[PDB]
Design a binder for this molecule. Structure first.
Ligand SMILES: CCCCCCCCCO[C@@H]1O[C@H](CO)[C@@H](O)[C@H](O)[C@H]1O
Ligand SMILES: CCCCCCCCCO[C@@H]1O[C@H](CO)[C@@H](O)[C@H](O)[C@H]1O
Length: 372
């Protein structure tokens, strides 16, 4: 009953925390406009947010292992809210980026403890309540947040996100009850696990070289309307939900085959992004594949990480999330460079290189370790 109420207030927080990671992709120009930059330069806020989560997610999780979670959640929420107020009234791109380092700290801690808190209250579908909040962040959180950005501006988008957290924080204060390192070398010494981390960083770099700049790409390269970009992002968000269900149905026994097929499919979408940019329905139909491909890739490797480190899922997850974010920041940076020094239309072809590498690498490591 109220058990459900608290797992539910956890899911709305998941949705809120994931939406703010996502929304900069759909406010890049709006943000660029307010600070007089080209849209690609704004990509630095993505790199910098993702690398701070990466370098901190494993350290943060350890240092906060002895803190009771209700006290922990409140502090991370306070940091989160304060940071979004700071994004709203930020007086320089530098101040905006500094606010984004603040939200990165809260996110890093927040994803440490949120699955554990979901299972503590009654369980398997208590966990799916946290995932569906992520899911909603994808198909609703990012698209709606862009629409708010277009009407009210990007600052109000960040301001609204913090207010929602604040409302969520208060529900958590009423609803929450009292909530009372040596694995790295062993995990390092598992080449099958290390190979998945390697795969993860390469393939995520591939995807985010293009995905980070899809908004300026759609409007300034494909030259479609601002509202076409918003629809594409809902397609991608809904395509991700689609990929999420096929994986959930066949992932436990076809994860390797699913991962490599999805990587092949992602490679193909990257290479055909600029060619498909002349037809709005080609881009829209491409993005449906793109969205399906990338979410199957991400969950397949997450399931490999679990299958390879059941003895230490916490640090393995902290490691997986960390290296996943390194690929996020690398994708934005490479995308940033291809856009500034070459052009944003090669964004699809440059992302294709590492996606190809990752394909071959996936094909190799699944031959070498085929039973999980
Ligand atoms: C080419 C070397 C092989 C790389 C394979 C990646 C697994 C080892 C990297 O772990 C490191 O752990 C640190 C924890 O703070 C972070 O800096 C970041 O998570 C990550 O880099
Ligand atoms: C952070 C992105 C910059 C790194 C460059 C991406 C390449 C990493 C892919 O791995 C390598 O691809 C080789 C191609 O020959 C394979 O032969 C080799 O097996 C494998 O080690």
């Amino acid at each position: 009953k109220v058990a459900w109420l608290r797992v539910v207030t956890l899911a709305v927080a998941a949705f809120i925390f994931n939406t703010t990671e996502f929304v900069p992709v759909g406010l890049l120009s709006d943000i660029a406009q307010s600070f007089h930059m080209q849209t690609a330069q704004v990509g630095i806020m993505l790199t910098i947010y993702a690398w701070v989560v990466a370098l901190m997610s494993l350290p943060f999780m350890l240092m906060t292992s002895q803190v009771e979670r209700r006290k922990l959640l409140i502090c991370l929420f306070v940091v989160f809210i304060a940071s979004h107020v700071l994004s709203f009234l930020s007086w320089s791109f530098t101040v905006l980026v500094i606010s984004r380092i603040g939200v990165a700290f809260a996110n890093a801690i927040f994803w440490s403890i949120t699955a554990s808190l979901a299972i503590r209250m009654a369980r398997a579908q208590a966990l799916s309540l946290i995932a569906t909040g992520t899911a909603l962040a994808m198909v609703l959180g990012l698209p709606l947040g862009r629409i708010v950005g277009q009407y009210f501006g990007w600052r109000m988008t960040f301001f609204a996100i913090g207010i929602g957290a604040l409302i969520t924080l208060l529900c958590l204060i009423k609803l929450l009850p009292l909530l009372p390192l040596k694995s790295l070398p062993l995990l390092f010494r598992r080449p099958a696990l290390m190979s998945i981390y390697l795969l993860t960083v390469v393939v995520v770099t591939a995807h985010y070289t293009a995905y980070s700049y899809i908004e300026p790409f759609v409007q300034n390269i494909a030259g479609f309307s601002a509202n076409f970009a918003t629809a594409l992002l809902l397609l991608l968000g809904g395509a991700g939900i689609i990929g999420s269900v096929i994986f959930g149905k066949l992932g436990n026994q076809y994860a390797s085959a699913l991962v490599s097929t999805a990587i092949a499919l992602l490679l193909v979408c990257l290479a055909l992004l600029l060619p498909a940019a002349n037809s709005e329905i080609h881009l829209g139909v491409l993005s449906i594949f793109w969205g399906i491909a990338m979410m199957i890739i991400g969950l397949g490797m997450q399931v490999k990480v679990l299958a390879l480190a059941p003895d230490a899922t916490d640090v393995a997850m902290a490691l997986f999330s960390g290296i996943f974010n390194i690929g996020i920041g690398a994708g934005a940076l490479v995308g940033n460079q291809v856009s500034l020094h070459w052009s944003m239309s090669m964004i699809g072809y440059v992302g294709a290189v590492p996606a190809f590498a990752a394909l071959i690498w996936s094909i190799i490591i699944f031959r070498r370790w085929p039973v999980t």
